[PDB]
Design a protein around this ligand. Structure first.
Ligand SMILES: Nc1ccc(-c2nnc([C@@H]3O[C@H](CO)[C@@H](O)[C@H](O)[C@H]3O)[nH]2)cc1
Ligand SMILES: Nc1ccc(-c2nnc([C@@H]3O[C@H](CO)[C@@H](O)[C@H](O)[C@H]3O)[nH]2)cc1
Ligand SMILES: O=c1[nH]cnc2c1ncn2[C@@H]1O[C@@H](COP(=O)(O)O)[C@@H](O)[C@H]1O
Ligand SMILES: O=c1[nH]cnc2c1ncn2[C@@H]1O[C@@H](COP(=O)(O)O)[C@@H](O)[C@H]1O
Ligand SMILES: *Cc1c(COP(=O)(O)O)cnc(C)c1O
Ligand SMILES: *Cc1c(COP(=O)(O)O)cnc(C)c1O
Lengths: 810, 810
């Protein structure tokens, strides 16, 4: 049907049909008379996978022969989502598969919906890793993603009586056709034990062994025949483990628990032993694999010329002392040479300045679990502080602030300090964030080693986040400017020539309308609720967190409700306010916010005076597959974090690419988005970072705003008095108490400006032609936010490799 | 090369090569430059599996269409061994695969050795189930094997310092290409809870749910295109299980432990809660599957016409009360109708009379775990004893003896009594055993219901146990009498015509010699030990147990050693004495026997005066794959259980088919083997059952034998004084103490006759022509011991179905 989906040639379609029937019979062991849609999904998945294999084998051979510098991206999270459609897009097979399935009497879109998300991340950090893998393959880099194969990914969210309930995400129940187990490359990982000092150095002995078994998943680049690998480790007990007999076998679970479950925290550090084991497990297995590959190309001087290790936050920070351990204890390099190699190999990306998110591990945990690593960390620290002392003689307080070891009731290791000391490059993830790092939390380090500090503004892959999820928009763009923009997103600037083109204005608005109808239908089918598709779709989807200020959105929703109740017969621009996201299971306030949102919906959605002018919907189980549905349908993107708290954001970019306008603070990448589009084409409001600092100096007093803003006082009185919870009048007292007395994120301080700015949104929505023209100006300037741009900068400025757009042979 | 391996046609070989290369590339994702022998094994396995699939699908369709009576064989154990070779044999693909692999530069015999045994049983009972499945498919019966997919099967045995050590049998580590997961047919199983009585009957409520996920394995018949199913259940937790968050996910292991590990006891009852859960799990999942299939053909009157359930010992005995539960509580049949259906559907096979092996479950365990089943058992008991009382009025002691409920310190349910009450047929597994059941432990039941009691003498499949493991023997037989004997083993009687044929005598002896050389080479390669292949191979392989009397064999070995030391320059017929088998991990005396055997070897094998005249080898890790190697190599089969203790034996039959002579007691199936071959062609010794009873009446006094037999006294003095354990002189005092004071199996009572009979063996071995003629008389009369004969009798006399040798279309 549509150009960007590729050709449906007669021979291709015939061959796909034949292989589909082959897999149904031989692989699935079904006949067509008892096959279900799930069987059909698997038959298609196996058919598409067969097209990856030849390219995968030959890509890996090519790297063996050419021996390029290899890039290892280490992350505890890879939020991959579904694989079927993405594979078809990247191999140009989508129209052919659609035609082949159609001729077999099947609807491919229905089959796509059967696939489970690979939910091996929490949100933005995990999803960034996934976009990065797609971009590294598209740019022809010899790149490997290394992580953990969690048996249970991010929990499935159910809403019961307006409250979040969690269910295990048993994503492997029906099998994963995309992975290949590689039990033959299983490696040992050591824990506990003790250090003994011989005449020939330190030896780590009496350890417990867990095996790391790798599973490989292919990562196809966009139409270049490159297929890279994501290698995820699974924990296995050795066969003599604990070897009465029956109990010993059952206790194998103790070792295998390492890879059982993803910790479900976003921007929060939970200092549990099992998490530390996960972090070491991934590092120890990965580094052995890296060294094996390097030796199969004595001379570790060339190691940083052949290897780059990128640390996705501090979660894999033990790579630094592990690399030292291997080089010093096992390869017998002198300390100084080993350190040189380590620093030149490793680079560190920071993704947050929130203090509760920074990893600070108690020394007693490391002492017990990883006694040799603790010794190495202490030695790193002493040598590092000797440099600080020579550079800043007599500055004793600087020595305390920069130490890797934090003193206190409990001594802790600051892993961020370790990463800076042991990396040749340190970057933040948007310009304002990278500046904040240099001015505040890493100021001392910046003064010592200014050359280490860089910025790499985040991005998103336009394959998944435009072509895959919004084919209608991709097509109308391609009609005007061709297909080259899909791997060169800067070409979208050519669309500025069509801002006054009546046909293009019409087509952009038509695509949005179609996406809105499709989404409104999805809601009725799967969740039995009726929404008005002519209303403005006002969307805030992201993890639930105080810093992201879902609560500020709630205050605006109640303000609109109260204004309608005050003047029921006045016209207002109709809205559907959609809020979705998961709360971490132990984060009480985040769970209370979800309950508030559903409670507001219970009042607003059933008030007959409101009608269809205002609807408040909580979108259940927000995840990558749901993002692909709701983002193309959105008119207004809510990006309303307190200035200085959202390091970048990436949902913001997804909305910009898909034809929503943004209401937001000057935070994270929002700043750069407004710069690219023009401030006149963005709905900017609220305190800047400098304003937040000024308020902190004076002291934030929320009572002042309550006393001065009658509309705000009314809302707080409604919350306190039980207007939104009649059977339990005190249900929201924790929320009220937080807002009035201990709000770290200054919700009330941005309320007035936010409401006023929302009024400007509504005014522009009344003029569809001007709304759509502003949309075009946003889509047209979204090019900078391609993860292809981001990865090219990492490649050239950190890893020392040149990207390529050249095709390998097919 | 050899006829019975089938044709290697040009098109067949070309097609196998092409599909092998396809699986190596697409299924395994390897190129030939880095493929290992393991990859080649998998590529061949997938290639052979593809030939099963069409036949499997069409066999199951055929049963759906024709709706024959279905046979459900319920077992906690299926000791399957390797699948690759057996599949090739049954599909007539062996020569073609050999040729295809040869042309690819690969040795198929080497690839066969890579496959793991499916070790989901302990010994004879589990292996009988496996032979039975092969025979049911070969006879065209609509049969299903139902069991548990243990993650860990029978442990791998290592010998360290002469002692058994156990290691987990991680048989699934590299994947199992033969099974197909069927997550779509997952069913719930309930545990714990309580019973409430409504006006509409009893309801079992507040239960914990575990899911049963089936995995299906194909079971091919011999060249008839029938492929039946073995369905094994695996335990999974529901996704809301225990649903802080992290611990709840980790605690899913509690539910999943049900299918984790095979209890490693042979002929011993261990009354643990986890075992009871296993037994109910398999029954509850299986019965739902049976009922589903029956309803997809209100009228349960036809249930016994469409369903037969065979209980493999009492291990699945909960099928009886579970079927009643379903019919009464869920389908709402009246009790009497439900009981009629149950009795006509179920049949019970007993495999042991040893009191320590009989399952007697404490009432308190059933009360907690399965409260509704305990109520049903009590009701069964009361109604059953009412019948007994009406038949034998006033016989109060009979009421006590026959009760399903045993009184005592702890009340227990006798599961064997339950099985008899609830089954229309009860059988033993050899004629003497079935007679013992009627005269001793089940005498009261036999008097009440004589018609229930039957015999079904055991057998072995001649596919695995002749054609597969001894192709050389199969071929020389086929040269004379054709190939029909492989599915009609009674045709081996035609070989009696060749007992005086010089060429046949030569060929039989040549095949044995070849098998002996091959086995002696296997020993040197894999276990660094040198044996004389001209010696008599004297073999006792079976689980280590006091009743099997490995100790009696040890006494003979020491007797031979002592006689050599007394008269070193006298000729004796050289022997290699091989003993192998696993001890249950908690069975101390069995572990001490293993140590004694290796200790005897340490002395005998290093005495220069002995030379190569006597060698004592402990065969490590005896399992199905090792049986297939050692049995064809054996000259003498040791079958020396105390009369009345081995219910049948099946190793005995394997040796008879493969050209070994038997030394044995008149126990189990040995009696029938001697009857078929003629007592003159069997080395029979020792007490008969009647002699054992006479000694028990008088009182067994082992001291009498010690006092009267100087050769025996010498051995006991050697054991006691530390001759076989110089560093630990008292190491064997438990063995000596048992033999002298509490030997339940009367080792000393059969010693003199055993030694004398062994002298007759040695005398016959000196005359190779007469030895070989006796061998021919044994092979020629082994036909009765085909499991095809056994299954035809079950079919006609218990299940009410007619076997068929007709081919389904290919
Ligand atoms: N456990 C744990 C789990 C996750 C995190 C964490 N830290 N930063 C992030 C997100 O990374 C994204 C990608 O750079 C940013 O766009 C976003 O602003 C930021 O909040 N996630 C921290 C701890
Ligand atoms: N846990 C457990 C596990 C196993 C058993 C058990 N009972 N009998 C047997 C063997 O069955 C074989 C097949 O019928 C007989 O040939 C053999 O003589 C007999 O000893 N195994 C009992 C308990
Ligand atoms: O010794 C070799 N000969 C040929 N190819 C090799 C050899 N070692 C590695 N390779 C190639 O590189 C491998 C990629 O996996 P790796 O071993 O994880 O790097 C294989 O897929 C081979 O194609
Ligand atoms: O409704 C039906 N139509 C056609 N074939 C069926 C149907 N139900 C079961 N079958 C056949 O029997 C099945 C065997 O699996 P079962 O459901 O476990 O008995 C399938 O393999 C089908 O070939
Ligand atoms: C992009 C994305 C995120 C990150 O959104 P932010 O608004 O930047 O926090 C989180 N979750 C999912 C499922 C995503 O696709
Ligand atoms: C046949 C067999 C058995 C049973 O042997 P018995 O001598 O009858 O006890 C036990 N284990 C294995 C591996 C077998 O093949």
């Amino acid at each position: 049907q549509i150009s960007v989906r590729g050709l449906a040639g007669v021979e291709n379609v015939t061959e796909l049909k034949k292989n589909f029937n082959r897999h149904l019979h031989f692989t699935l062991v079904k006949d067509r008379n008892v096959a279900t849609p799930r069987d059909y999904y698997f038959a298609l998945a196996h058919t598409v996978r067969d097209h990856l294999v030849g390219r995968w084998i030959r890509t890996q051979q090519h790297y063996y022969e050419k021996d390029p510098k290899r890039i290892y991206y280490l992350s505890l999270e890879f939020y991959m989502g579904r694989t079927l459609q993405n594979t078809m897009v990247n191999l140009a097979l989508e129209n052919a598969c659609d035609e082949a399935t159609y001729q077999l009497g099947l609807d491919m879109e229905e089959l796509e919906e059967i696939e489970e998300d690979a939910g091996l991340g929490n949100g933005g950090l995990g999803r960034l890793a996934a976009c990065f893998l797609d971009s590294m393959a598209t740019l022809g880099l010899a790149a490997y993603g290394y992580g953990i194969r969690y048996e249970f990914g991010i929990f499935n969210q159910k809403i019961c009586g307006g409250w979040q309930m969690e269910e295990a995400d048993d994503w492997l129940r029906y099998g994963n056709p995309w992975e290949k187990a590689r039990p033959e490359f299983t490696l040992p990982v050591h824990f506990y034990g003790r250090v003994e000092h011989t005449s020939q150095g330190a030896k780590w002995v009496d350890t417990q062994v867990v095996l790391a078994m790798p599973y490989d998943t292919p990562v196809p680049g966009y139409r270049n025949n490159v297929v890279n690998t994501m290698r995820l480790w699974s924990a296995k007990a050795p066969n003599d483990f604990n070897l009465g007999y029956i109990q010993a076998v059952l206790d194998r679970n103790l070792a295998e628990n390492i890879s059982r479950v993803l910790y479900p925290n976003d921007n929060f550090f939970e200092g549990k032993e099992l998490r530390l084991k996960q972090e070491y497990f991934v590092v120890a297995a990965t580094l052995q694999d890296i060294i094996r590959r390097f030796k199969s190309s004595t001379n570790f001087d060339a190691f940083p010329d052949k290897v780059a290790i990128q640390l996705n936050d501090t979660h894999p920070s033990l790579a630094i002392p592990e690399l030292m351990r291997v080089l010093v204890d096992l390869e017998r390099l002198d300390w100084d040479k080993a350190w040189e190699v380590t620093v030149k190999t490793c680079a560190y990306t920071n993704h947050t300045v929130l203090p509760e998110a920074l990893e600070r591990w108690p020394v007693h945990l490391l002492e017990t679990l990883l006694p040799r690593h603790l010794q190495i960390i202490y030695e790193i620290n002493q040598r590092f502080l000797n440099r600080v002392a020579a550079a800043f003689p007599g500055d004793v307080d600087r020595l305390r602030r920069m130490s890797l070891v934090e003193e206190g009731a409990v001594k802790r290791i600051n892993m961020a300090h370790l990463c800076i000391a042991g990396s040749h490059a340190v970057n933040g993830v948007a310009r304002i964030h990278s500046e904040i790092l240099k001015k505040t939390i890493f100021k001392d380090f910046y003064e010592l080693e200014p050359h280490k500090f860089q910025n790499k503004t985040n991005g998103i892959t336009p394959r998944r986040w435009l072509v895959l999820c919004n084919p209608g928009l991709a097509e109308i763009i391609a009609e005007r400017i061709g297909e080259e923009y899909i791997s060169d997103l800067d070409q979208l600037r050519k669309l500025l020539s069509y801002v006054d083109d009546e046909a293009f204005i019409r087509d952009v608005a038509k695509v949005k309308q179609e996406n809105k109808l499709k989404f409104a239908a999805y809601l009725e089918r799967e969740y039995k609720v009726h929404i008005n598709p002519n209303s403005l779709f006002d969307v805030q989807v992201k993890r639930i967190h105080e810093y992201k200020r879902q609560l500020l959105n709630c205050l605006h929703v109640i303000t609109l409700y109260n204004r309608i109740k005050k003047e029921p017969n006045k016209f207002v621009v109709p809205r559907t306010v959609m809020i979705g996201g998961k709360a971490a299971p132990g984060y009480h306030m985040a769970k209370m916010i979800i309950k508030l949102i559903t409670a507001i919906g219970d009042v607003v959605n059933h008030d007959p005076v409101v009608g269809d002018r205002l609807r408040v919907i909580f979108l259940e189980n927000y995840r990558v597959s749901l993002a692909e549905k709701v983002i193309p349908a959105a008119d207004l993107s809510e990006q309303i974090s307190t200035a200085g708290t959202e390091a970048s954001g990436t949902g913001n970019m997804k909305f910009m690419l898909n034809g929503a306008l943004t209401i937001g603070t000057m935070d994270g990448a929002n700043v750069e988005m407004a710069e690219e589009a023009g401030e006149e084409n963005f709905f900017i409001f609220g305190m800047r970072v400098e304003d937040v600092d000024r308020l902190d100096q004076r002291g934030y007093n929320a009572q002042e705003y309550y006393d001065r803003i009658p509309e705000l006082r009314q809302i707080i009185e409604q919350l306190s008095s039980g207007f939104f919870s009649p059977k339990q009048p005190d249900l929201f007292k924790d929320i009220v108490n937080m807002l009035m007395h201990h709000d770290r994120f200054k919700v009330f301080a941005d309320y007035e400006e936010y409401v006023k700015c929302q009024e400007r949104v509504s005014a522009l929505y009344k003029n569809p032609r001007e709304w759509t023209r502003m949309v075009i100006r946003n889509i047209a300037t979204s090019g900078k936010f391609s993860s292809d741009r981001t990865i090219a900068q990492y490649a050239r400025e950190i890893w020392g490799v040149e990207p390529s757009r050249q095709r390998l042979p097919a």
